[model samples]
Each structure stands twice: as C-alpha cells, then as structure tokens.
Target: PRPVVLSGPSGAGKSTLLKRLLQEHSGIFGFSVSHTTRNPRPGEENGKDYYFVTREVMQRDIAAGDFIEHAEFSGNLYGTSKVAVQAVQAMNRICVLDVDLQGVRNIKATDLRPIYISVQPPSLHVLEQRLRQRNTETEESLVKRLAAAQADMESSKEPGLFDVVIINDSLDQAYAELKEALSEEIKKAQR
Candidate 1:
C-alpha cells in the first residue's frame, strides 16, 4: 500500500483527523513513529508517540543515513526514520506520516512516493481562534506559531505540492473529505 503524508500548520486539526482515521480504520493503517531529540510531553511514551533519543544518538543515525528526512527546529531535532516506514510496510499496512512542509519536500526528493495531503484552516483569523482555544500556546509561542502557520499556508498554495487540500472549517466535512481522498487506498487495504 502507498504511504500517506499529512502536512498542516499547528492548529489545522491534523491530529484530530488522524485520531478519527485511526479509530475508525483500526488495523488498516499504522503511524510511522518519528525520531526526536526533544523530550516527551506528559502522557507520551517512548517508541510510541516518538522514539525519543538524545541529540548524539539521533545525529549518529542521521549520519548513518537511517532517516528518510530530518530537520532542526527550535533547538530540537526531529526526523522520520526509514525503519519506521519499513515497519509499517512489513505489517502490510498503509503508513500515515505527520510531517511538516520541509519534511514533505524532503520526502518528495526520495523514492517513498507518498500521497501528499494538506489540511488548511479557512483563514488566519480562524486559525488563531483555534490555536487560542487549544490553550497549549503562550502569548509568545502563539505569535511564533502564527507566523509559521502563515508561511505554511503560503507554501501549501504552491500548485502540485499537495495532491489534496482540505479546508478544515468543519470537522465533519474535513473528515469526510479526507476519507474520500484516500478511498482508493482504503479499499486496497481492506482487500
């Protein structure tokens, strides 16, 4: 089965949609666990949410070319390991990757051939509202995220960058559209 790359800004509801997809599809899909140098948050587990590792170990893996793509952000390193993709493939399941725009570009440069999907907010105003509602960001971090989100939205508009662009103004509509966009893959997995 073809892997999927889901890209979106911080407040674009990518996590919500992914949760729904995994819950509804169950055994049909698997998450490609990413590697990160950052510490895990509360309730997060190692080898589950991420393969949390030290900067030294992650760098060594990157040097060994074990990662499909890697990037440094806000003093932390994160990357998608090729083994994660292989693990899902070994399970005969479609791998779902949550990646950033840079990561998507990096993946495109490789032979992974994942279907790219972008989830976007209707407007910056709406995005800001959603981010604030999450209560996960402080004033400073919110401004930084808003700036990054603007850049992401602009990049997402570049033609051919994304196979499907879903405007996440409504949860139900976005979920339906996402499922519809992957219907062919879903059928393949079911068979």
Candidate 2:
C-alpha cells in the first residue's frame, strides 16, 4: 500500500501495532510527524510525537493545501501532511496513517488511494475497560471518546468503508494479522 490509513477507537492498540511494526520491520515507514493543536505531554517532543502547532497554524495549513486530511478530533486538531506522505514515497516505503473516520473519508477522495483498516476491539465493554485502564483522559474526555468509539463501531458496519477489519482482542494475534495484511499489500504493490 502506498498510504495505509488505520482507523478505530481511541485505545484500540493501533499505536501499539504501529510501534511493533517499526520495531520488527526494518524498512517500513510509519508517519512520525503529526500536526496537532494540543501541547506535548510529559516527555513528548516536538516533531517526534507530533508537530505541535497553534490552531491558527493548523487552519493556515488547511487553507494553504498542506494537509491531505485534516480533522478536529475531540476538540483537538489533527492532520496528515502532504510532505509526510511524500517523504515515505521518497524512501519507497509504506506510509501508515492513523486517522479517524472523517479523515479516512477525506483521504479516500484523493488519488492516493489509501488502504483502509479498522482496528476494533472485540466488544464495547472491553473498549471501555481499556480506555479506563489507560488513565490518560479526564472523565469528560473519556466519556466523549467512548461515545465516539460507539459511533465508529456503527460506522464500521458499512460494507465498503474499510478494506479490512482487524479485531484487537489479543495484541499478538492482531499484530500477526496486521503484518500479514501489510506483507500482502507490499507484494501487490510490487506487481
């Protein structure tokens, strides 16, 4: 896949899987830079975890045709840059995008033709427990994310919205499945 878009709930182990892919696979390119309006937390660094920017800067990029897909996710701004995609392509590497549903839709409109995957939890109860266990969100924020996750689950019922659906019931199983799918895509791209 040229650009693969990973979509799911807030705590669906998408990040975990991406991290593992980078660790195990030598040449795979995961998009490291994110454009966000939120500040870096704890030990996070600028341009590493995210390209932290102002709300104005984000809107400016939107107007200037910088982002491939930009969305205001849960009161915070998040976007994928065109340059980021090109950087991956330049290295002849797969560009992995972690985007929400709306951003995935936006990317689908472009000629890039990103492969879409929905990394979902096995059940809503498990999803809720995972979110609570993360201990990173405030009560209000957690509630909003859970509500959004429910909407995402409903959206996943649409037949053509995603190319594949991977249930993250077990991290090892999910990672294995993801790696297999990615390997297949890479082989197809070569042909």
Candidate 3:
C-alpha cells in the first residue's frame, strides 16, 4: 500500500485534520511512528508517540542505514525508520507520514511512493492570525514560524510538488476535499 505524506506549516490544522480522519476511518489507516532523539513531552508514551532514543543509538542506527529518512532539527535527530512503515503495513492498513518539507524530499528519493498532499493556509496574514490565536508561541518563535511558513507556502506552489494542495480557509471544506482526494485509497483499504 502506498503511504500518504502530509506536509504543512505550523497552525495550518494538519494535525487536527489527520486526527479526524483517523478517528472516522479507524481501521483503514495506521500512523508510522517516527524515531527521535528528543525527549518525550508530558503524557507522551515511548513507542506510541515516538521511539525516543539516545543520541548515540540514533546515530548508530543512521550509520547502519536503518532509517529511510532522517533529519536533524533544533539539535536533535529525527527519522522515520523503515521498520515503522513495515509495522503499519503488516497490519494491512495504509500508512500515514507526517513529515516536513525536507522529509518529503528525502522520501521522494526512496522507493516509497506516497500520495503527497499539502495543507496550506489561505495567506500569510491568515496564518499569522491563526498562530497568534493558538497562544502557544513566544514572540521569537512566532516570527520564526511565520518565516518558515512563508517558505513552505512558496514551495507548496511548485509544479508537481504535491498531488493535491488544499487551502485550509475553512475546516469543513478542507476536510471534505481531503476525504475526496483519498476516496480511492479508502475504498482499496475497505476491499
């Protein structure tokens, strides 16, 4: 089964949309848990949320070619191991990968052909407003995220970068579009 690759900037509601999709189609999809060197946040389980490992172990695995895609962010290593995707496939469910732009590019280099989808904000101004409303970003982080979002928005416009680009101006409409885009895959899973 081909995996689904979802990419978006912060506050674009990708996580919320993904959660709803998984809830609605419980047995049809399975998340590919990523491996990371970062510490687990409060209430986050070890293998469920992420395979948290020491830097040395992660580095060793990377050197051993255990990860299909890996990246270092904010001084910590993060990666999607091939075993993770295999685990989802073993259960006979479609795998879903939530990765950044770099991860998308990296995955494209491999044999894992996924249906690429970009969840974009209507505009930078609207994205900024949404970020502010979250009230979780510090002033510095907000500025940094806005800059990254701008870059992501621009990249999302590139030709052939994504199979579908959905502007999340309205959650209902976006969700509808998402469901429609994956209708074929959903049907396949059902069969």
Candidate 4:
C-alpha cells in the first residue's frame, strides 16, 4: 500500500482518526517511526515513540536524503524517516504520517508518491472550541495555535496538493469520509 500523509490542525482530530483506524483495522495500518531531537517524555520508548537523536546527527541524515519530511519546532528537530515508512511498506501495511504544513510541503518536494490528506475544522471557532474542551491550552499557546491553524487552512486550498480534504465537523461523519477516501487502499490491504 502507498504511504498516506495526513496534515491537520492540532485539534482537528488527526490523532483521533489515526488511533481509531489503527485499532479497528489493526495490522493493516502502521505509523512511521518519526525521528526527533526532543528528550523522551516519561514512559516514552525510543524507536517506538520516536528515534531520538542529536541535532547534528538528524541534520546530517536530512541532508543525506534519509528523511521524507523534516522540520523544527520549539527549538528542536523532528522528522519522519524514509527508512521508517518503507519498512512498514515492506510488510504490506499502509504507512501513515501525521506532519505539520512545513513537513507536508517538504514531502511534496520529494518523490515519495504518498496519498496526501488534509483534515480541516469546519471553522476556526470550532477548532478553538475543540482545543478549549481538551483543557490543554494556555492563552498564549491557544493564540499561537489558532494562527498556525489559519495558515494551514489557507494552504489546504492549493491546487492538487491534497488528494482528499476531510472537514472534521463531526467525528462519525469525518471518520466515515476518511474510510471512504482510503477505500481503494483498504481493498488492497485486504490481501
């Protein structure tokens, strides 16, 4: 199966959809083992959660064309390695990646031939509401996220950039549409 690249606002339920698909579908789908320079959080395992590395080493890997998408966030580097994606592909699973807009742009500049998907909130207000409901937002962080989200929504309109745009107004409806978008890939994974 081809790799699926997903881009969405923070509260747009990207992980929520991905988790549901992985649980319900099981072995047919898998996440790319992303690399990062950030320290592992408590209980986070290396190579499972992320392949932690030094900035110098990760940069070298990026320059060497080992990464499918790479970006810097909060002063640290993060990337999805091509090696990680292809490993899952080798196992006949549909590899998935959840990346920011910059990473999505970088992937477009490569020849990965992934199925690009962009998840969008029905509106910025709905996105803000979802973030607030999570209770994980500070005033400053919320403002920053909304700004980033606005930019993402704008970029989602670029012609032919995304194979599917799933507006996440409702979880059930959005999940159904997501499944429909990948129906062809799902059929292939049936073997």
Candidate 5:
C-alpha cells in the first residue's frame, strides 16, 4: 500500500487537517505513536498524541537505531519509529505521517512506498499571523520558526519530490482535495 506523508512548514494547519481526516476517514490508519522528548501539551494524551520520553532515553534510542528518522526541532527531539510501518501494514490501511521535510527525505530513501504531499499555507503573512496566535513561542522563537518555514517552503520547490501539492487557502477545499487524492491512491494500492 502507499503510505501517505503530509509534509509542510510549521503553522500550515497540518494538525487541524489531519484531525479532520482521521475523524472522517475510518480506513486511513495513523502510524504507531513514538516517543518524543517534548512534554505533552494541553489535551494531548501520552500514547495517542505522542510518546513522551526523557532526553536521555531519546538520545539512547537514536544511538540504538530505534528511530527511522529523528530530529531536534525547537529544542525537542521528535522521531518516527521503524516499527511504525509494520504496525500500519498490520492494520491493512494507509498510514498518514505528519512530518517535516527532513523526515520526508529519509522516508523516500527507504523501501516503503510513499505518496508525498506538500501542504503549504496560502501566504507567509497568514502563516506568521497563525504562529503568533498560537502563543506558544517567544518573539525570538517565532522569528526562528518563520525563518525555518521560509527555508522549508523553498526546499519544497525541488521538482519531483512531492507527488501532490495542496495550498491550504480554503480549509474545506484543501480537506476535500486530500480526500480525493487518498481515494485515488487507495485504488492504486489495491492493484
């Protein structure tokens, strides 16, 4: 089956769209949760949202070759496990991975069949406003995130990396487009 990779810059509304997709599409199974060094945020469950681990364990896991791809993002280590693919296969459903560009490259190098989709915000102004509204980052951190976002966007312009590109201008439209794309992929997977 073709596992789906949803790659985008920070504050591109990937989480919101992912939640809605999971709510609506019962067959699209999410990958097994992995441990992160970051603490859980409001309303986030330990195993459901992410596996919260200490920095020591995170580094040890990295050294032990447990993670398929891991990165230090915003001062916290986030990763996806190699076993996640097997878990998705067991469910006999497509796995939806919400990851950054670096992870996307890692996945592309692996044998796992992936459908790369880039979800970009309509404009940088809107992205900056949304990041500020989150109220989670300091002014310095916000500047860093915005800078990273611009670099992400530029790197995404590399041709042939993404199978599909969806600009998240209208929430409803983008949601529908993702659904349709996945439906087509599901058909192809069955072949």
Candidate 6:
C-alpha cells in the first residue's frame, strides 16, 4: 500500500480517529517521523512524538530538500522528511502522514504518490462550538483557527485535492468510511 496523506483543520476529530486506527490495527500502519521546531512536552519522546529540532536546522534541511513536505504553522516549522517515510516503508507497513493543506500540495509536487484523505466538520459554526467546548484556545487563536478552517473547508470543495473527504459528523460513520477507504491496505497489512 502507498502512503496515506491525511489532512484536516483543527477540531475535525482527526487525531481521535487516527489514534483509534493505530490502536485497533497496530503494526499495520506506521507513522513517519516528523520534524518540528517546538519544545517537547512531558512524555514526548524525541524520535517518537516528533523529531524536535531547532528552527534553524529545519530550515536548513528544507532548503536542502531533505523534507518531502513541510509547513510553517504558528511560528513553528513542521516537516515530513524523506528519510522518515522511507523508515516506515522499510518495515513493510503502510505509512500514514497527517499534514496541513500546504503540506498536501507540497507532497503532490513530489514523486511520493500517496492516498490523500481529508476530515472536515459539517459547518464552520459547529467547529467553533467544538473549540469552545474544549476551552483550551485563546480567543485570538480561535479566530486564527476559524480562519484557517474556513479556507480548509473551501479547499475541500475543490475536486482532485483528496481521494476521500470524510464529513466527520459522526465518528462512527467517519471511522467506518476511513476504514472502508483503506480496506485494501488493511487487507495487505493483516494478511
């Protein structure tokens, strides 16, 4: 199976869905190590959670084209290095990458042909409510998040951008669809 490129705006329940997928079907799909210019939090292993690095080195690698896809988000850089994806490939496991819209386009420009998927909320207002429910966002950041989400929703409407766009209104159906779309890869993984 080819690599899976999953992209969605915040609060689309993508993380939860991904968590469940990895847990329910372990050793089948593996994560590509991503580089991030951020301080590691508690329990966040260096090479596991992310390849934490200085912004300078990340920028240097990007300039050198060491990264397959990259994006600068919220004053930090995040990238999927070519080596990381190959690391996943080395294990004969399907590589699943969670990236932003910009990263999606970048990946496409490369030769890394992968299954593209997007998870989206039903409405912008619904997304707002979910963010509010979390109470973990500053009003300013919320505004920024909503703005990005608006663009993401609009981008999702564009055909040819994604192989599957899951309208994540219900986690049950969304998860079902996600699994359904990757049925072939799952079969190969478990076979």
Better of 2 and 4 by TM-score: 2
Clashes of each: 0, 0, 0, 0, 0, 0
Measured against the true structure, the TM-scores of the candidates, in listed sequence, are 0.91, 0.91, 0.87, 0.84, 0.91, 0.88
Q: Rate the local accuracy (lDDT) of all candidates.
A: 0.87, 0.81, 0.84, 0.82, 0.79, 0.83
Residue-by-residue lDDT tens digits, candidate 4, 1-191:
67798887778888778878888887788878889986776666888768989988998998898886788753568898879987888888998888888888888888777889999889888988887776655677667677787878887766567889999888899999999999988888886
lDDT per residue for candidate 6 within 1-191, as digits (tens), equals 77888887877877668878888876898887899996775667899768999988998998899987788765568999989999989998999988878888888888888888998888888887876776655687667777788888778766678988898898899999999999977887778
Q: Which is the better candidate, 4 or 5, if ranked by lDDT?
A: 4
In candidate 3, position 75 carries an lDDT of 54
| lDDT (Cα, tens digit) per residue for candidate 5, span 48-107 | 768798999888988999888887666678888877667777878777888887788888
Judging by TM-score, tell me the better candidate of 3 and 6.
6
What order do you get sorting by lDDT, best first? 1, 3, 6, 4, 2, 5
lDDT score of residue 14 within candidate 1: 89
Clashing pairs in 5: none
lDDT (10s digit) by residue, model 1, range 22-70: 8888699898899998777667789877999999999999889999899
lDDT of 5: 0.79
Worst 10 residues of 4 by lDDT: 134-143
Report the poorest 10 consecutive residues by lDDT, candidate 5: 25-34
Whose lDDT is greatest here?
1
In candidate 6, the residue pairs with backbone N, CA or C atoms under 3 Å apart (3 or more residues apart, or in different chains) clash, namely none
Displacement of the residue 167 alpha carbon in candidate 5, Å? 0.7
Per-residue error for 159 in candidate 5, Å, reads 2.7
